[PDB]
Amino acid sequence: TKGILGRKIGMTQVFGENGELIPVTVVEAKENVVLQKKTVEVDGYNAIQVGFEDKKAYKKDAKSNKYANKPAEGHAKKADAAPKRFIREFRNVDVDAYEVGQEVSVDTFVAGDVIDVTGVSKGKGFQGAIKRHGQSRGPMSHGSHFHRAPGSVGMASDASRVFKGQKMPGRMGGNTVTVQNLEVVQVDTENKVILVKGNVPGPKKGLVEIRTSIK
Amino acid sequence: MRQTFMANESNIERKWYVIDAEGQTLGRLSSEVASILRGKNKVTYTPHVDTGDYVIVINASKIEFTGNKETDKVYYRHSNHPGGIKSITAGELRRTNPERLIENSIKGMLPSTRLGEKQGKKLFVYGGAEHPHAAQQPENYELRG
């Protein structure tokens, strides 16, 4: 249960009870609406889908993404709503709540809940073997000509090939990753933020998916 | 090179049969079916075109084995990764995805050519007595045992 969407803002700290200091990531989770209810009869699995951040309406000569287009307009009208930027699905929730067109408010979480956060990583570009994997580097003196290369890549002539999954260089990059068993420490209703204890993947103004813990 | 009939397109007729698989052993069913799909019961058989016709197998969860080869007779598989050998037993495939049990036995009895791949797509296998293909009007076919 209890899914919501938001974007990263930054990172601060909060003094807990009895003077304990805890690092805090602040997530703004604003104007989330329920946009389509999916059914095991029509689709084969029960889920809801949620749109996060609204954008401007249809225009004739749009040249970018901040104006919705005609397929997105009709989809976001069948539920009476404004067109959104991010749309995800949550299939952990109970589908018998959540009438279509509701606003999932930020205070569906209470301080003390354990949650899981999902986002995409930062992204580093083309990176070598000792950065991308945790490899040891060669000696830096005593005549060596081997500093940051990878080592050997196989055997001799039995297996006259390189096996796959060999950890060569390439794009380090940002891919999806979840962190588990975090906590909600303080929920602000007026500013519509959530404070979570720890740190979440992604750059600033990213996109995070918060849902309750599976364990 | 006097005179010998050679089949052709605009020349051949394909029809639809239905086999039921209950009470039949796996290999002795499969050897019969693979000669239907190649067309070796037509009098106009020619080796370089696709004569032969469509087969539907409908029960496929009541296939029998003899001996102890439902706990033995494992099926292996490799993923082209180091140490990626994987396996499943024959009794396991019967209770879970039994359609792939039969169609792997039959496609192993077909040649590995370009035509042999195209002939193997004329097989349709279902667990339990229903099939969608009532529009094509198939017939019953009893196995010449």
């Binding site: - | 005179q3 009939f5 009098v43």
Partner: protein, 58 residues
């Protein structure tokens, strides 16, 4: 190729290939495999008639 077609045409009359050309020899017929394959494609009614002359010669 000729034998494969004769074997298909004989099994529509409940005969093997083997017992067809056994009994066809004892009847005294000396027709080819090539000619016997063409009769079964062209004239099915004539092919069924020499099946019976092979079948009662056994």
């Amino acid at each position: 190729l000729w034998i494969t077609r004769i074997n298909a045409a004989a099994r529509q009359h409940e005969m093997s290939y083997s017992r067809l050309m056994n009994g066809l020899k004892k009847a005294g017929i000396d027709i080819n495999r090539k000619m016997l394959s063409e009769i079964a494609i062209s004239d099915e009614k004539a092919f069924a008639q020499l099946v019976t002359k092979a079948k009662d010669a056994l």
